Symmetry: C2
Subunit: 306 residues, 2 copies
């Protein structure tokens, strides 16, 4: 029992992290097979970060402009033998294939989805934490200068989905990055100018998951027979900066396990949003929305008599 924020074991991703340098600038990259991925802003002199001309920067490079180091973990000696730009990322080709390349995909994640982040500096894995892709296409992380190129991922069995490469900080504790197709989440630009940030929202389906976790952990004071339909809830959500609730198999499994209907927790959310009545839920006195239905199912896993 218990529900806490937890991340995937990081070892197989740690074996893929490298340091990438372009002249005077250094950041992190991800080595898979004969490719190293990194932020294209490694090419940009400090004094040009407010208005980079990335096409001109790329033209100015040769394969010799870049180096890749891996001194940490299983060491490797790598030479850059090709370079290309794909959106907001560089795709470097190296002469040695990573001998510990995991089975992987590159698939962009949607808001409300959680992933593990391996925060790195100078190619050294430093910490790991879990974030949720927010409704405004930011993540709420902990990153300092030099963390660009840190990666985010999920795992399903042995298959890793690489979904995030860190780029920038927008505001205190507010971050964003690229998907591995080279697009930036939220269409933010890798340019240091002001950029519009849409308002964040509570992720309704995750709040529902957390309340189910609470019930499964013997905290059910907020359950009443009162229901709010998914339709009425969604109408309310549009007025109260909650996301649209979309039910899933994962949420349905929690409803079956607890015997409490989704609609009972939608009603509970509307009430708890106005106040917790001097009470706590799983040690919190405010709504929690970064525990997904999948995370709760994994943490409260049980055999089922049939």
């Amino acid at each position: 029992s218990g529900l806490v924020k937890m991340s995937h074991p990081s070892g197989d991703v740690e074996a893929c992290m490298v340091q990438v340098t372009c002249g005077s600038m250094t950041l992190n990259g991800l080595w898979l097979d004969n490719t190293v991925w990194c932020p294209r802003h490694v090419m940009c002199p400090a004094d040009q970060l407010s208005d980079p001309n990335y096409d001109a920067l790329l033209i100015s490079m040769t394969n010799h402009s870049f180096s890749v180091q891996k001194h940490i973990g299983a060491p490797a000696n790598l030479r850059v033998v090709g370079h290309a730009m794909q959106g907001t990322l560089l795709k470097l080709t190296v002469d040695v294939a990573n001998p510990s390349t995991p089975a992987y995909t590159f698939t962009t994640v949607k808001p409300g989805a959680a992933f593990s982040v391996l925060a790195c500096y100078n190619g050294r894995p430093t910490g790991t934490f879990t974030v949720v892709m927010r409704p405004n296409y930011t993540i709420k992380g902990s990153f300092l200068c030099g963390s660009a190129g840190s990666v985010g991922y999920t795992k399903e069995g042995s298959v890793i989905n690489f979904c995030y490469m860190h780029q920038m900080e927008l505001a205190n504790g507010t971050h964003t990055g690229s998907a591995f197709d080279g697009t930036m989440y939220g269409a933010f630009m890798d340019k240091q100018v002001h950029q519009v940030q849409l308002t964040d929202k509570y992720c309704s389906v995750n709040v529902v998951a957390w309340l189910y976790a609470a019930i499964l952990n013997g905290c059910a004071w907020f359950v009443k027979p009162n229901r709010t339909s998914v339709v009425s809830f969604n109408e309310w959500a549009l007025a109260n900066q909650f996301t649209e609730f979309v039910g899933t198999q994962s949420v349905d499994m929690l409803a079956v396990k607890t015997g409490v209907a989704i609609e009972q927790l939608l009603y509970a959310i509307q009430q708890l949003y106005t106040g917790f009545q001097g009470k706590q839920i799983l040690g919190s006195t405010m709504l929690e929305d970064e525990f997904t239905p999948e995370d709760v199912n994994m943490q409260i896993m049980g055999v089922v008599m049939q």
Copy 2:
């Protein structure tokens, strides 16, 4: 910027995890050098877990009673060539040294100290999270049956300090385990009977660190010129379910960086304990005490 619950990368410890089987029971173990550490209740069949006779069980075992297997991972079989009971742990000697043994030490953590946990089932790592040793010598984690033998540790410079091997659940969301000398944190018994826990307390020094983190993340609304002395705070703490505040260099570095004295934050704590009254600190409406001064200094100033 930002402050989040964070754990160490787990790969070095992943490379040390094995499963240990004895009879019908399979748990996790930690393989370092020619030694495998695991919970002693691996000996006790599941139906006997509420009143184990560990001495009688131990007398009945031979080296052949224990099977140790390492999963891919780098593969390894492994033969047990010795065994000893050390408090609530078994220390098994095996015939092959772990070729990926990290630089390590064994430590015993104190209340308020944080460590990373690598949660494992049948020798396979499934997740990692960070906990604090509570003032009542429990931890608040997320563990299911089969997780015993999971490993808690910190990393100091180049060295892993192993400090916890998971043993049991005491109540919902409330766990304990042992140090590697075999001593259970909080002196709880490794048996499946109800055991009373001491009342938990807020970890004062960690609440201070978190308030400093808040100030360093543009959240300083609670700062006033008012002060409460360390001595006066600690008298108040005895009566109000707070631990004794003891200053450290890590805390002083935060005081210097922010220009806000420890005593301003001790006063703030005394007012905030009564409730936040519709206000938030770093996204929370309650006091947070599982961010240590060292964690804050790392996350905010990068001070390895």
